[PDB]
Design a protein around this ligand. Structure first.
Ligand SMILES: [Mg+2]
Ligand SMILES: [Zn+2]
Ligand SMILES: [Zn+2]
Ligand SMILES: [Zn+2]
Lengths: 147, 265, 45, 69, 87, 171, 115
RNA sequence: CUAAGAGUAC
């Protein structure tokens, strides 16, 4: 405990001393890039999607979200969004005319993890659907925390 | 012949005794073992089917893991790590189930008397949550407004307080020796007179006060300890002491066994 | 289809992609997705 | 939030002494020290556990449930 | 380079190896050993290139020379053999 | 901005030597050192490659002489890799590795001394109490940085010129 | 993140044994015994019982780091006395004393009427 | 990308 260090009792921590909850919210909107270029919340498919992130998409259900209660780790996709693009482009070796959508997903923070607490769907001022995903984790005191 | 014991107070949850004719190391080792080496049963895994309460799931799981459970026959249960089942079975765990609904117009208190044992116990005396108060309701687990429901299933394994403090059966253990400071193991802080400023311990009545003129006894060692063991409730307070002695003896015997088995190879 | 709950009715509403995001009982536009059915495992520690 | 199950310092079970404590303060008109001594909390580690608790769960319960069945 | 090279018979620098010279000699020799250069000393089981180079320096089997540059551009060539490693 | 650097909170440790620094295990797994494959170290480098990058100690990459870089993640599918003299194994930093250690308001040389790695199982850099005076570092929330040398020359001069014991008496 | 599992404090790891004995080259007839997954509880007791022995010249123990559950016990006995034998006798004495203590406590507890 | 704000250790 020299130089402003502290010695905290491990057993007291085990019984609930200074334990905390942490909530983080991710917001996402679908936006009208044009008259009929509206983004759509969905589960992207590798068959017809570009720039899909290296994180797993398995945890997303049909409407491109995650039901509350599912454990999520770093870089896992929690909001699946796609935007239309001009078709008939061939490049990169594995890009065919089927890749008519660009992935605009929102992955979880690369360092954080926890249980998805609450997802909320609603409409913005312009009338377009948007969502907010709140994720809950537990912070237990350890070596390095400041008191 | 050996360590001698004389107990002053015997209660349901406290035992107060004197441990004489024994070394300081032995008494301290016994105290440490009683603190964090006696196996006990406690809830370890929680499956939350439904939770519409105002508390988080891991909040309730943390509260549930801290509920004391009967551990009289915990020696018959096996650790989950050295059992042949997949995740949990009847030979190594006890399955409880909590199911509460807020059907009343007022707030409904979910206590620990509402926990129900589902898995068969095969005649053992483990699993039942410990009830202490006069009302009969155990630990207040949660509270429900009207229309809120909490359904969950708990798996309880055996463990020791080293792995987690929730498995500790011993609460606070009072330990004292040499109330009159005849061994001079402390140098008393004082302003005017150290005798007036330091209150006498209750154990000073059990030893002869120093004559105030005799020379310092440099050959005297430390013995005749005064101890008081409290029980959380998982096991009776006398069983805490007995099983602590047994566990320390087992540790020393295991050292002997390892020494002999590596001596023969 | 996928289920949601109104923010101020606690009413269960199954909606598809083409459905407008509203409550059919009060017209509220805030909806909360329903709890998942897959089991959740918690360490009581 | 809600009364802790066990004392942080020693580990004595204090989670079942909350409603009795409130009853002693209300029905018997006892002061806090006598009520704590009546429940068997003799070490000040347990006395601070019960004495300083703020029962925020009631405020949370005042709001209507999000999912009502 | 003929004009620059101070003849060996009238070098005027210290005969002691400096700390920087020793550090760079050890680094260079350890780097060469790591790239499968032949070893000039018998190994007693050591495998770390740095300590191999240290052993080579202890008994003066490092075939390198330091070119100490004077501020005017002239230089003196001191072999590692003849430099006294007092430090 | 440079690569092969780490930064985190510091805590004191009376059980460490003066020239040692305690390195968190995850930091030790992220930072790597490229070791040239030699007849003297073929066995242990092969063993580290077999262990892989997910457990410590282990290797994260294999740099071939052709320049191709075998990522040990996703390489277990291809099977065991045979090492050849002259290749490089980019492997986790182990014990007794010279590392430069710094506290950012660096006002003099002794604030950038070189320590020896000691892998520890927590999330803070651990250093001796006595060495905190040249760093002007407390443990009230201070953060410090770690730089890993990537060659034998830099490693050698970092151990032979910037080592903590050599800086005990300051000019 | 970097926090190790708690069961590592007492469960023997894979490929390691409870005891390992190394001869000590500093002094004659001295050994160093490393106990794995142990702490002050056993070390202090073993040290004290060894110091009770009359043919033990030196007995000490130390836990080198709080992070890891292991300790080192140095034992040096007189000539012609194996330090392993001294350890065996210390453990036997500890076991006998604990057994007598358990018997005495059970007999004293059985005499209670207010329990 | 830019701008702005709150900071942490000196
Ligand atoms: Mg500071
Ligand atoms: Zn089983
Ligand atoms: Zn509605
Ligand atoms: Zn207490």
């Amino acid at each position: 405990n020299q130089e402003d260090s502290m010695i905290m009792n491990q057993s007291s921590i085990d019984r609930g001393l200074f334990r905390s909850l942490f909530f983080r919210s991710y917001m996402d909107q679908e936006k009208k890039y044009g008259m009929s270029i509206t983004e759509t919340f969905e589960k992207p498919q590798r068959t017809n999607t570009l720039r899909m992130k290296h994180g797993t998409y398995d945890k997303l259900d049909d409407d491109g979200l995650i039901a509350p209660g599912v454990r999520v780790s770093g870089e896992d996709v929690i909001i699946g969004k796609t935007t239309p693009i001009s078709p008939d482009e061939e490049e990169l070796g594995q890009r065919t005319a089927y890749h008519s959508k660009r992935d605009a997903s929102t992955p979880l923070r690369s360092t954080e993890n926890g249980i998805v607490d609450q997802v909320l769907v609603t409409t913005n001022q312009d009338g377009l659907k948007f969502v907010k995903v709140r994720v809950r984790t537990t912070k237990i005191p350890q070596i390095g925390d400041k008191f | 012949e050996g360590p001698q014991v004389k107990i002053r107070e015997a209660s349901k949850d406290n035992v107060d005794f004197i441990l004489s004719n024994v070394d300081l190391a032995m008494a301290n080792s016994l105290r440490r073992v009683m603190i964090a080496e006696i196996p006990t049963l406690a809830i370890d895994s929680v499956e939350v089917e439904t939770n519409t309460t105002v508390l988080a799931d891991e909040f309730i799981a943390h509260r549930l893991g801290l509920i004391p459970l009967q551990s009289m026959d915990i020696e018959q249960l096996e650790y989950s790590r050295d059992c042949f089942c997949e995740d949990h079975c009847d030979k190594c765990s006890v399955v409880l189930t909590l199911q509460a609904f807020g059907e009343s117009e007022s707030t409904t208190n979910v206590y620990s008397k509402d926990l129900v044992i589902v898995s068969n116990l095969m005649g053992r005396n483990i699993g039942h949550p410990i009830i202490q108060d006069k009302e009969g309701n155990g630990v207040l687990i949660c509270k429900l407004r009207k229309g809120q429901e909490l359904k969950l299933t708990c798996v309880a394994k055996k463990g020791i307080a080293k792995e987690h403090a929730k498995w500790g059966p011993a609460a606070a253990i009072e330990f004292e020796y040499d109330p009159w400071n005849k061994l001079k193991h402390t140098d008393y802080w004082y302003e005017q007179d150290s005798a007036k400023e330091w209150p006498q311990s209750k154990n000073c009545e059990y030893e002869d006060p120093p004559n105030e003129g005799d020379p310092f006894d440099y050959k005297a060692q430390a013995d005749t300890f005064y101890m008081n063991v409290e029980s959380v409730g998982s096991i009776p307070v006398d069983q805490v002491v007995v099983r602590g002695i047994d566990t320390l003896q087992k540790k020393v015997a295991s050292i002997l066994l390892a020494l002999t088995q590596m001596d023969q190879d | 289809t996928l289920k949601y709950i109104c923010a101020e009715c606690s009413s269960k509403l199954s909606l598809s992609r083409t459905d407008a995001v509203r409550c059919k009982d009060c017209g509220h536009r805030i909806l909360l997705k329903a709890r998942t059915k897959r089991l959740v495992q918690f360490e009581a520690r | 939030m809600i009364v802790p199950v066990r004392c942080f310092s020693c580990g004595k079970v204090v989670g079942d002494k909350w409603e009795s404590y409130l009853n002693l303060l209300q029905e018997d008109e006892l002061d806090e020290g006598t009520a704590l001594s009546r429940l068997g909390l003799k070490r000040y580690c347990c006395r601070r556990m019960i004495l300083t608790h703020v029962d925020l769960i009631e405020k949370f319960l005042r709001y209507n449930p999000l999912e009502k069945r | 380079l003929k004009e620059k090279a101070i003849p060996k018979d009238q070098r005027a620098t210290t005969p002691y190896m400096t700390k920087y010279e020793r550090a760079r000699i050890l680094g260079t020799r350890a780097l060469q050993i790591s790239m499968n250069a032949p070893v000039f000393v018998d190994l007693e089981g050591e495998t770390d290139p740095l300590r191999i180079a240290m052993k080579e320096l202890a008994e003066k089997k490092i075939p390198l020379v330091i070119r100490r540059y004077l501020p005017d551009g002239s230089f003196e060539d001191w072999s590692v053999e003849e430099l006294i490693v007092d430090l | 901005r440079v690569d092969f650097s780490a930064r985190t909170v510091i805590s004191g440790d009376p059980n460490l030597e003066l020239d040692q620094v305690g390195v968190p295990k995850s930091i030790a797994k992220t930072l790597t050192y490229p070791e040239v494959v030699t007849p003297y170290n073929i066995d242990r480098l092969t063993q580290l490659v077999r262990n892989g990058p997910n457990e410590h100690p282990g290797a994260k990459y294999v740099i071939r002489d052709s320049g191709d870089r075998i990522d040990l993640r996703y390489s277990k599918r291809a099977g065991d890799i045979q090492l050849q003299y002259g290749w490089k194994v980019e492997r986790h930093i182990m014990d007794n590795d010279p590392v430069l250690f710094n506290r950012q308001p660096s006002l003099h040389k002794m604030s950038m001394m070189a320590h020896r790695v000691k892998v520890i199982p927590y999330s803070t850099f651990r250093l001796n109490l006595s060495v905190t005076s040249p760093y002007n570092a407390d443990f009230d929330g201070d953060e410090m940085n770690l730089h890993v040398p990537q060659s034998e020359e830099t490693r050698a001069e970092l151990s032979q010129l910037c080592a903590v014991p050599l800086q005990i008496v300051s000019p | 993140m970097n926090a190790p599992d708690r069961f590592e404090l007492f469960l023997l790891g894979e490929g390691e044994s409870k005891l390992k004995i190394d001869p000590d080259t500093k002094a004659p007839n001295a050994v160093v015994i490393t106990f794995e997954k142990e702490d002050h509880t056993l070390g202090n007791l073993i040290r004290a019982e060894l110091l009770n022995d009359r043919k033990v010249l030196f007995a000490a123990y130390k836990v080198e780091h709080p992070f890891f559950a292991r300790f080192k016990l140095r034992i040096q006995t007189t000539e012609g006395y194996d330090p392993k034998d001294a350890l065996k006798n210390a453990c036997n004495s500890i076991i006998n004393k604990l057994g007598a203590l358990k018997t005495n406590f059970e007999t004293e507890w059985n005499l209670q009427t207010l329990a």
